[PDB]
């Protein structure tokens, strides 16, 4: 009766270590999925920040290009003012 009892203590011990590991596995697996979806947030908001910066760059260039075009049209109006003055000469 003594050897089968030692087969029994080792058998329960081996099956024990398996359950502990599968519990741990579930913990590791859930920990990874947790950190991942959170990291999916952490990267999505990284892409959104790049988008906000792009819009700011688009706003900055809009006023720059718009003002550059007005430089030409202000030239036109001042030029017309003198030509009208030259036409007032003759």
């Amino acid at each position: 009766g003594s050897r089968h009892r030692l087969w029994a203590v080792i058998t329960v011990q081996a099956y024990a270590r398996g359950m502990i590991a599968r519990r741990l596995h579930r913990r590791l697996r859930v920990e990874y999925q947790r950190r991942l979806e959170a990291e999916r947030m952490r990267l999505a908001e990284e892409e959104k920040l790049r988008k906000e910066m792009s819009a700011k760059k688009a706003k900055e260039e809009a006023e720059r290009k718009h003002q550059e075009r007005l430089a030409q049209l202000a030239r036109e109006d001042a030029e017309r003012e003198l030509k009208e003055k030259e036409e007032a000469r003759r």
Binding site: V9, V12, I20
Partner: protein, 140 residues
């Protein structure tokens, strides 16, 4: 038979959780069991002496180790637990079981039995039925 792509994928998931790209021999035990295996540490040392001089196991080696060791159940652990139900009533003292594992056979640490008994703590009446264990241990 050869391990299907489903199995190899499941195995890579386990192996990867343990950034070396190879697993230690100590972790090797835990990785094999996490994939449904239940070997004793005796069976482990034979397999680790078979492929070390290195010091570690990588996934291909690990797959050959998962090919080497293979399970041909719930009756074996029931009968192993039957040796604990001295009454044959189907129940076993928690305290008695704790004394068996820690000091007899494969010495489990106070951590290890605490984890086994941690969920058992919900069961604890001083004595505990093993059917809650047989179900918990078998489930993956």
């Amino acid at each position: 038979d050869q391990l299907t792509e489903e199995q190899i994928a499941e195995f890579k998931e386990a192996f990867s959780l343990f950034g070396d790209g190879t697993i230690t021999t100590k972790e090797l035990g835990t990785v094999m069991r996490s994939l449904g295996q239940n070997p004793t540490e005796a069976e482990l040392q034979d397999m680790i002496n078979e492929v070390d001089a290195n010091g570690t196991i990588d996934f291909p080696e690990f797959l050959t180790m998962m090919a080497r060791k293979m399970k041909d159940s719930e009756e074996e652990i029931r009968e192993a637990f039957r040796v604990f139900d001295k009454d044959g009533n189907g129940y076993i003292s928690a305290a008695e079981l704790r004394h068996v594992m820690t000091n007899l056979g494969e010495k489990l640490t106070d951590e290890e039995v605490d984890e086994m008994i941690r969920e058992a703590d919900i069961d604890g009446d001083g004595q505990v039925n093993y059917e809650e264990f047989v179900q918990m241990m078998t489930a993956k």
